[PDB]
Write a protein that binds this DNA or RNA. Structure first.
Lengths: 237, 365, 101
RNA sequence: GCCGUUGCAUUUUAUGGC
RNA sequence: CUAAUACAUGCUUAAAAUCUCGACCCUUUGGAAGAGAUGUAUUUAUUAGAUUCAUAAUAACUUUUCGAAUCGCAUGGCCUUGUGCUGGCGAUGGUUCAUUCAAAUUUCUGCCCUAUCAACUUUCGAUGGUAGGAUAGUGGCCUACCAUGGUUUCAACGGGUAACGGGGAAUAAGGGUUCGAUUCCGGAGAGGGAGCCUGAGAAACGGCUACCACAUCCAAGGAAGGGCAGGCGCUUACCCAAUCCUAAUUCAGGGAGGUAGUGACAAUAAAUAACGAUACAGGGCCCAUUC
């Protein structure tokens, strides 16, 4: 990846180089994830060089969602738990009110799960069904109530399902793409749109409405009462 | 830090212990008292430093040690003062105490054996020392200089840090706290400036309110600001100044204009208002003490909202020109250096009770 | 030798690299462009580890003279200087051999 | 610490002049 | 002459093994005659799908494919000790799916002017359907049959803009200048031709064979490169320390990248002196060229 071709949510300025760290192939997309090299020296700033990254990578300080991933440019995406065992830090990757990834230091058991919207449900080999989440993870043997547009609280010590929340009106949403990235308000109503592009209307606790696609609507809980500690700013914008 | 010690009401003022000591010097310019047993240091225009012990609150300050220079030390690398010493300041470790005056040098002294441990040339014919102020719990010397400078030293290593420029007349008064900032006045430019040492910036507050507009006030219901004589820092967010016409100006760091100005304090006696010749606040408190040659130290209580201040009272035990105020505690012991004339060699008129010495006043609770 | 008075600010504990980063300030009245060697000596006596546990670089001086600001480093041990430092600075400090090719 | 004056009688305490 | 990282060979373990059920007995922390069943790739056919996809059996198919003779940290567990079972930590391949990176087909939107351009296309596919071939893939994409069709007046098509195309970068009327040879990509060509290859991704010419122009060497048999850049006409060196990419990959590399040469059409600051002192000496200077 080249510079002035890197996306805006990495917060990198026009000087200092010619190329950008291209996100590697992985469970997340290239456009809505932030690489590990961009995470530690450009957000947390505790390294200074690109060479200083690989020294930290080969000392096993870091692990993403319980797994180390000691590649330079691994695409850590949304709801990912980056864990610094040295100095005892835990992190959750969440967007700002402007669309950029935020640092939110989380607790020790809030770092023991994540929330995964399932993308698709099909009947696998030998009669067992399976769900496929948005973060490149598959879970076989699901609860048969779980279908598409449902988020799943994931165990993170095993690949098993601990909780699921169905896509309903009045359940705590979070925008994951588009112009309205980073807003909350649990649902106004739905539009069918036979032919795709399904519009879900959201009005916040500060009583203002907006329109996003069904692509971007990611529920995280019930009204009020979230299932993850939200940063300051509260997605109200 | 902000103002938190609220004890203006607790001060029993009317029965404060008042006493006075006559000393063997003419025209004592300053007094500086250490608190870690408590010490005291006095310099006069008779070329002398004198060390007192004031750890016993019921007693007058008894004599420990004293040192007087002479005309031997005419050159400027001599280890002694050969002219009037205008200010004195003790280091917060109790190990050194430095003097300087019209001999345009800076002589650091040992508190133990009273020996000249350092002499520093200011290297300017206009680099006269006027006020030395130490940062609280530090050794970074702030030196007001008559060539419109502020010179910053270190004590433990005896070096020079940096110099601030900017004023338009002679910097008389400078006050500091434990942070790295200080307030200065230029005393005829009719402004005061706040100095951030690492930021190397200044914030300039402006006096000079015309009494003509006050004559508008005289239609609604005085005297000229000509010389901002003293400045004192109450907290890191506000300060005060004392003028040549009885007005005492309260200042906020968010206010370009005076957030308060008190009208005539020590009074008059066409007519002549008294000069605000001394001004010293108790640190991080709401209480401050202003002094004149009128004969009574007037003490004032800052309001809780930092918007006005109110009279605590008057202490009439000290007749003569009050040059410098020191306040120590444990109870409270007030010391005041009373000289026969003003600090600057200035002329004084018809003073009742011409005497030289130290005022002491103990206030309980 | 004019009371060097090396001042340090911006101290942040960095235990994941086992170090403490801080901006070195070098006031030097009547003294010009002192060293890289004496600086590592005289800031290791406020942290009290060793000379070769101290890295330093940078230092574009003030215009005219009398002030110099660079960038300083201190580690927890000698072996950390052999792992966490760049390869040419250790040759510069003397702690390594530059295999020329 | 120059002088005067008062209570303890001067060390102690208070006041006037240079 | 002779090795393996070469070629051809075979258990899937204590008699296979593991699962369910069971006429009955007994209450249980249970036990039984007998009764059923089990890995897997390719092509076609049938049927279930109640609540042709998945899933399954069925009947055949293929050169009938696979089925752990593995690797390291340690020289590993266990008994009266058997050709024993395999392997404490985690490592590779193989079966199959999704994802990621992409790649390919596809929807809509989007530039000047022009009727002094009113009809365009068919024919040997233009339009539709049938069926077949072809490809990684649905599809007139291609071929045989049948029909005579499809677009268009708030405008199809024909035609000019010497700007190879836009997103974009500066002055900042948005009209405009410059670049579009663009910072990102798309079309062309590597002497000209046809055929052929590798890789998931090339139509590779900065891959191969052959044909054609075409020249260099010759010991006279034969062997060989593709007519190219660069400069004048108006002297070009060093280094992977940073960014990113690659790695037999914490080593190093990069005709990626970074660092010195070149100077009156212009133009930029200011140096070539500053301050004192005395004895001699005056017909010294200006205006009317005048008087």
């Amino acid at each position: 990846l080249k510079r002035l071709a890197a996306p805006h949510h990495w917060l990198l300025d026009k000087l200092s180089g010619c190329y950008a760290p291209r996100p590697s192939a992985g469970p997340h997309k290239l456009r809505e994830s932030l690489p590990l090299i961009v995470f530690l020296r450009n957000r947390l700033k505790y390294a200074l060089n690109g060479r200083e990254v690989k020294a930290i990578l080969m000392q096993r300080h870091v692990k993403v969602d319980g797994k180390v991933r000691t590649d330079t440019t691994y695409p850590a995406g949304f709801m990912d738990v980056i864990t610094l065992d040295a100095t005892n830090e835990n992190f959750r990757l969440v967007y700002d009110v402007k669309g950029r990834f935020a640092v939110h230091r989380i607790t020790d058991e809030e770092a023991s799960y994540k929330l995964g919207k399932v993308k698709k449900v099909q009947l696998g080999k030998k009669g067992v069904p399976y769900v496929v989440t948005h973060d490149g993870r598959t879970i076989r043997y699901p609860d048969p109530n779980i279908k598409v547009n449902d988020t799943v609280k994931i165990d993170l010590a095993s690949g098993k399902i601990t909780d699921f929340i169905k896509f309903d009106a009045g359940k705590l949403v979070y925008v994951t793409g588009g112009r309205n990235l980073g807003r909350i308000g649990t649902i106004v109503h739905k539009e069918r749109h036979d032919g795709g592009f399904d519009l879900v209307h959201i009005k916040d606790s500060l009583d203002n409405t907006f329109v996003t696609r069904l692509n971007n609507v990611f529920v995280i809980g019930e009204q009020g009462k979230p299932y993850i500690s939200l940063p300051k700013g509260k997605g109200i914008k | 830090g902000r103002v938190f010690r609220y004890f203006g009401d607790k001060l029993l003022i009317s029965e404060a212990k008042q006493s006075f000591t006559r000393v063997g010097e003419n025209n004592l310019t300053c007094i500086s008292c250490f608190q870690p047993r408590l010490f005291a240091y006095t310099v006069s225009k008779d070329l002398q430093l004198t060390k007192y012990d004031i750890t016993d609150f019921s007693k007058r300050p008894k004599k420990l040690k004293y040192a007087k220079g002479g005309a031997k030390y005419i050159p400027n690398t001599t280890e002694g003062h050969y002219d009037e010493i205008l200010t004195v300041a003790a280091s917060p470790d109790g190990k050194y105490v430095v003097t300087g005056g019209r001999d345009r040098k800076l002589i650091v002294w040992s508190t133990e054996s009273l020996s000249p441990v350092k002499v520093i040339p200011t290297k300017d014919r206009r680099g006269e020392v006027l006020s030395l102020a130490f940062r609280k719990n530090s050794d970074q010397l702030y030196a007001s200089c008559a060539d419109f400078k502020i010179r910053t030293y270190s004590i433990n290593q005896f070096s020079q840090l940096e110099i601030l420029y900017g004023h338009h007349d002679i910097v008389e008064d400078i006050s500091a706290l434990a942070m790295e900032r200080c307030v200065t006045v230029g005393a005829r430019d009719r402004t005061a400036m706040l100095w951030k040492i690492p930021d190397e910036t200044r914030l300039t507050f402006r006096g000079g309110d015309e009494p003509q507009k006050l004559l508008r006030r005289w239609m609604k219901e005085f005297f000229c600001e000509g010389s901002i004589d003293v400045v004192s820092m109450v907290d890191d967010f506000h300060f005060i100044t004392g003028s040549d016409n009885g007005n005492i100006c309260l200042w906020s760091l968010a206010k370009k204009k005076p957030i308060f100005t008190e009208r005539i304090a020590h009074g008059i006696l066409l007519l002549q208002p008294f000069w605000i010749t001394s001004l010293y606040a108790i640190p991080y408190s709401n209480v401050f003490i202003s002094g004149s040659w009128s004969g009574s130290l007037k003490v004032w209580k800052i309001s809780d909202n930092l918007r006005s201040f109110e009279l605590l009272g008057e202490l009439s035990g000290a007749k003569g020109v009050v040059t410098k105020i020191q306040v120590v505690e444990s109870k409270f012991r007030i010391l005041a250096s009373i000289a026969k004339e003003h600090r600057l060699g200035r002329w004084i008129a018809n003073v009742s009770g011409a005497r030289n010495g130290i005022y002491s006043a103990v206030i309980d609770q | 030798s004019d009371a060097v008075t090396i001042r340090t600010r911006k101290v942040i504990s960095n235990p994941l690299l086992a170090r403490k980063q801080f901006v070195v300030d070098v006031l030097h009245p009547n003294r010009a462009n002192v060293s890289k060697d004496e600086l590592r000596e005289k800031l290791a006596e406020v942290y009290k580890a060793e000379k070769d546990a101290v890295s330093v670089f940078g230092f574009r001086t003030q215009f005219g003279g009398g002030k110099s600001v660079g960038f300083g480093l201190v580690y927890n041990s000698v072996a950390e200087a052999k792992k966490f430092e760049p390869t040419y600075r250790l040759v510069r400090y003397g702690l390594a051999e530059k295999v020329e090719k």
